[PDB]
RNA sequence: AGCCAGGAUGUUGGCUUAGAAGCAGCCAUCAUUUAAAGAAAGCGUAAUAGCUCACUGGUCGAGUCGGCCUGCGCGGAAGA
């Protein structure tokens, strides 16, 4: 799980999602994209 | 019990013998006899050709037999027999290589439809034209 | 598909096949499997022409629309994927048996087997092959 | 007899020193034992030895799969024309030209194996040729050795530029410096880097008896554009404190002084001498700069140090050629090759102390 | 958009005839079997093997999708 200003997907699993209103990005493949904030 | 189930296709370099050395821990994946296979090897050779490539199609059934299929030789080692050409492609503006009649490429269709199957084999003589179009080799009537 | 061109060009292509064709023999056999694509595509090249093309476009306003001339007992094979194939080179010839041979040769399915023509009607086997 | 086959019994020439040195049944019998060590299914457990091997097999091919078929065409392409002149065969007169090329580009594919020892063959290099004490006679023999390869290099084609010189106080000269230019300068003369000997009467004593002088000559490219100072602040931690204190109330304040601390190394450098901050920042990258490259000078001493460890260590294994000249008589004592045409050899007839010398090297 | 099938043919395709064989720098973009398949989107293994997407059909069956011009917000935003 990365923290950046900027999130993007990274992959073709790679999702948004809004959890807490708090932009993050999960991945069902590779759990190296995991991403925060944004 | 089992038909094809372990399922290959190999058979690199036809033109020399005995594939023990380079290949033999290919088939040494399952523990396949090796003599068994390279009588075979030299037992498809002699008969048809011993000095190029042609790939082979094997599967071995359960108490560790297999049976043999043979496969044509790929265009470009059999264009590389029927032309004799060291050149090929990657450079179209560099290197590229000359003409190809259309009825030794005929005989060739004869050859390759004669090891394969398909609908229209008139169809498929095509399409080794744009095989040998692709590796640099012109080709025409 | 793009548009109507693309569409009609899948229409017309099979609205030529029904006028001289005969027979209608059908299955579902979802597996197109690729030894089964050179078998079943080889020997209509290799027993009666190359008309006999895969299509499974078996929608009631689809195909049935790429047949409205002639054997209008076709539209009952409106449901689920269903590969038609009719019958030009030779009047309801031996294409059918071959082809059920391949349901001995695992051949996954065939929905709701029938022999359409050549009866004119369902359920009747063809056991009569008129070639 | 024939130019074409007797042609065929010089690529033989070629061909036999080639297949006694690296002993081509050998070196094929060497492939053998490596097959079934490759040919193994626990193998893949050592990924770095079948990689390391992968190749390996493949550098055994084209010295062994070059001269197994090398050996073949020896007896075809002679007996192709002997064929073809009895029955005047125009066309396989002609066929047997193409196979006169058929071994010897196989012989060219062993060259590459002939300038394969080298990471700068294709370099230009330098002659640099000292002299011996030998009194006048060392002197003068550097002046004959200089011409021995002088006459040389421009009897191939290979373009000779003097650089230094250094002649003697009576005659001849002390320490030439030539600098041999073009392609493939460094890679023939590769083989010449030690002492040269010769033996004949003198001619400078009065009475002139058989001195035994030397020289050497050793050769060097010096050829090189990559200089790496690694002033990359990735590096180059940065410390800044302030001064003793003699200004009064402001030098004690202002943080002036600053230190530049290498990351991987660890050598500090200092600098107080300026007031500014931004002065002595300059002036500590300036000396950083000087230290930095300095250590770089030193691991090159180092490794060239070491280098010549190997060297001083052979003493009387540093001769190359006996030219004893008192009974007209040449002795490549490295190899073994006895020449009796001195008046040949100061034309630059060395390329049989070549061919013998660096492929057997 | 999901759930069901295929995802091929020569082709282990010419590197320079050590190894990427739909996958490092290799080249170039073929023709057929066709509902349908790019000599290729990713992972992977010296290499392969193997699993999905491309694209296309069946099916429960309606609107849906990608940008642009903009008002007002969101994250970026940690100091005694
Ligand atoms: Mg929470
Ligand atoms: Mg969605
Ligand atoms: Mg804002
Ligand atoms: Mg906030
Ligand atoms: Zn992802």
Redesign the pocket.
């Not at chain 2, 496969?71 to 080692?77: F, I, R």
């Not at chain 3, 979802?30 to 690729?34: A, N």
């Not at chain 3, 006999?52 to 929608?59: E, G, W």
């Given at each position: 799980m990365k923290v950046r200003?900027?999130v993007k997907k990274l992959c073709r699993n790679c999702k948004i999602v809004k959890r807490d209103?708090v932009?993050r990005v999960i991945c069902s493949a590779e759990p190296k994209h995991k991403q925060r904030?944004? | 019990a089992k038909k094809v189930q372990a399922y290959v296709?190999?058979?690199?370099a036809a033109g020399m013998a005995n594939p023990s050395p380079p290949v033999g821990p290919?088939l040494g994946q399952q523990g396949v006899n090796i003599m068994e296979f390279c009588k075979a090897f030299n037992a498809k050779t002699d008969s048809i050709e011993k000095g190029l490539?042609?790939?082979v199609v094997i599967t071995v059934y359960a108490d560790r037999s297999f049976t043999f299929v043979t496969?044509?030789?790929?265009?470009?080692?059999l264009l590389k027999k029927a032309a004799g050409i060291?050149s090929?492609?990657?450079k179209?503006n560099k290197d590229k290589v000359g003409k190809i009649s259309r009825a030794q490429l005929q005989e060739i269709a004869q050859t390759?439809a004669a090891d394969?199957t398909?609908?229209?084999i008139e169809?498929?003589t095509?399409?080794?034209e744009?095989?040998a179009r692709?590796?640099?080799l012109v080709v025409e009537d | 598909?793009a548009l109507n061109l693309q569409d009609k060009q899948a229409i017309v292509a099979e609205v030529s096949e029904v006028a001289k064709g005969a027979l209608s023999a059908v299955v579902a056999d979802?597996?197109?499997?690729?030894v089964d694509?050179?078998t079943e595509?080889?020997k209509?090249?290799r027993e009666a022409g190359?008309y006999?093309?895969?299509?499974?476009?078996?929608?009631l306003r689809?195909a049935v629309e790429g047949t409205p001339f002639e054997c209008l007992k076709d539209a009952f094979v409106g449901?689920?994927?269903i590969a038609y194939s009719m019958e030009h080179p030779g009047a309801a010839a031996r294409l059918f048996k071959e082809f059920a041979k391949a349901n001995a040769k695992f051949e996954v399915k065939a929905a709701a087997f029938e022999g359409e023509l050549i009866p004119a009607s369902q359920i009747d086997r063809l056991a009569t092959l008129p070639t | 007899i024939n130019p074409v086959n007797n042609r065929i019994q010089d690529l033989t020439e070629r061909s036999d020193v080639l297949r006694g040195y690296l002993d081509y049944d050998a070196k094929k019998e060497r492939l053998e034992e490596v097959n079934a060590e490759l040919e193994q299914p626990d193998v893949?457990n050592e990924?770095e030895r079948?990689?390391a091997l992968?190749?390996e097999r493949?550098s055994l091919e084209a010295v062994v799969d070059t001269l197994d078929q090398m050996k073949q065409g020896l007896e075809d392409v002679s007996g192709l024309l002997e064929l073809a002149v009895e029955a005047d065969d125009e066309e396989t007169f002609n066929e047997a030209v193409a196979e006169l090329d058929a071994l010897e580009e196989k012989l060219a594919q062993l060259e590459f194996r002939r300038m394969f020892s080298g990471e700068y063959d294709s370099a230009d290099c330098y002659l640099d040729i000292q002299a011996g004490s030998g009194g006048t006679e060392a002197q003068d023999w550097a002046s004959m050795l200089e011409r021995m390869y002088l006459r040389w290099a421009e009897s191939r084609g290979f373009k000779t530029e003097i650089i230094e010189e250094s002649e003697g106080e009576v005659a001849g000269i002390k320490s030439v410096t030539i600098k041999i230019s073009g392609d493939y300068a460094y890679g023939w003369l590769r083989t010449e880097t030690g002492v040269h000997r010769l033996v004949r009467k003198s001619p400078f004593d009065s009475g002139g008896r058989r001195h035994t002088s030397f020289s050497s000559a050793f050769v060097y490219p010096e050829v090189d554009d990559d200089i790496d100072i690694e002033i990359n602040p990735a590096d180059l931690r940065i410390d800044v404190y302030r001064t003793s204190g003699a200004g009064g109330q402001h030098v004690n304040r202002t943080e002036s002084a600053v230190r530049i601390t290498h990351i991987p190394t660890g050598i500090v450098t200092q600098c107080q001498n300026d007031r500014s901050q931004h002065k002595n920042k300059d002036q500590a990258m300036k000396q950083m700069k000087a230290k930095l490259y300095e250590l770089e000078m030193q691991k090159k001493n180092a490794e060239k140090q070491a280098m010549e460890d190997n060297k001083s260590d052979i003493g009387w294994g540093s001769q190359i050629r006996s030219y004893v000249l008192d009974d007209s008589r040449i002795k490549d004592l490295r190899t073994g090759v006895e020449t009796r045409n001195t008046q040949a050899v100061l034309d630059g007839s060395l390329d049989q102390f070549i061919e013998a010398s660096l492929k057997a090297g």
């Open positions: 200003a900027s209103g932009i904030q944004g | 296709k190999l058979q690199v290919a490539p042609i790939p496969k044509t030789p790929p265009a470009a080692v060291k090929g492609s990657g179209p390759k394969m398909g609908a229209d169809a498929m095509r399409s080794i744009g095989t692709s590796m640099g | 598909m979802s597996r197109g499997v690729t694509k050179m595509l080889r209509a090249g190359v006999m093309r895969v299509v499974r476009n078996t929608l689809r449901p689920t994927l | 893949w990924p079948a990689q992968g190749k493949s």
